[PDB]
């Protein structure tokens, strides 16, 4: 959808992952998070409306989603190994990506 | 100084900023962190000793310090413009940079 919908999706599924106790639930939530992050990367945040596409600010904004997606992919691999707790710990650590982008651009 | 020397400097001074009794101590600690990070950026982590200066792992390692230096510079700017409580709040967010790189390479 749009950036507000993608953001609550990300937040909702972090909670799902912390709640869960098996690999399938974690995998499903991470998969949902991955789609939301890639969709949000296409948007321009309101505080960067007139910035150029390759501007330093737009570059760092887009890079933040690439990096979030990379670490979602890393947590997905752990869940696919049956390493539930390690996948959950990796998911919890995604909050650093949320907070970093927010402090720049939210 | 080698890598774990720089890491001790980063660890000690991040704690100084949180506990500092005055603003001059915040700036001085941020300055020491910045120097340690730029030195550490020129190191090879032991888990990557088998990688070239061009490996994707060495690239992400170097970029982590670039980004940490940028955010130290942001906090230094707050401190230099007299907004030292804001600089302290920004320094607290630096721990995510530590945790992210450690997740990969520590
Ligand atoms: C940039 C690279 C971001 C990353 C990574 C994450 N978010 Fe985000 N978020 C971003 C912006 C620019 C905004 C402002 C939206 C606006 O239209 O002003 C937000 C906002 C949120 C919100 C609030 C939703 C709202 O309608 O205001 C939430 C709940 C949120 N973000 C959650 C969130 C989480 C949990 C993230 C990590 C998993 C995350 N975001 C990453 C930009 C970016
Ligand atoms: C990569 C870009 C890193 C960033 C950013 C930070 N650290 Fe780090 N740290 C990194 C590596 C590769 C290692 C292992 C070094 C080794 O030779 O094994 C470390 C290690 C530490 C340690 C342990 C020190 C030791 O004697 O082994 C500490 C206390 C430490 N790091 C602290 C630290 C802090 C507080 C950081 C943020 C401010 C931080 N590091 C960033 C790689 C990276
Ligand atoms: Ni990473
Ligand atoms: Ni940044």
Swiss-Prot record, chains A, B:
Q: Which UniProt keywords apply?
A: Electron transport, Heme, Iron, Metal-binding, Periplasm, Signal, Transport
| Record's subcellular location | Periplasm
Top-rank lineage group of the source organism: Bacteria
Q: Which GO terms describe its biological process?
A: electron transport chain
Give the start-end ranges of region Disordered.
Answer: 38-60
Q: Tell me the residue numbers annotated for binding heme b.
A: 7
Q: Single GO molecular-function term?
A: heme binding
How does the annotation summarize its subunit structure?
Monomer.
Family membership: Belongs to the cytochrome b562 family.
Descriptive protein name: Soluble cytochrome b562
Per the record, the gene is cybC
């Amino acid at each position: 959808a749009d950036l507000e919908d993608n953001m609550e999706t990300l937040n909702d599924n972090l909670k799902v992952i912390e709640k869960a106790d098996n690999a399938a639930q974690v995998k499903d939530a991470l998969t949902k998070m991955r789609a939301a992050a890639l969709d949000a990367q296409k948007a321009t945040p309101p505080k960067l409306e007139d910035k150029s596409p390759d501007s330093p600010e737009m570059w760092h904004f887009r890079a933040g989603f690439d990096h979030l997606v990379g670490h979602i992919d890393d947590a997905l691999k752990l869940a696919n190994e049956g390493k539930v707790k390690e996948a959950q710990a990796a998911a919890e650590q995604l909050k650093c990506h949320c907070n970093h982008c927010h402090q720049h651009y939210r």
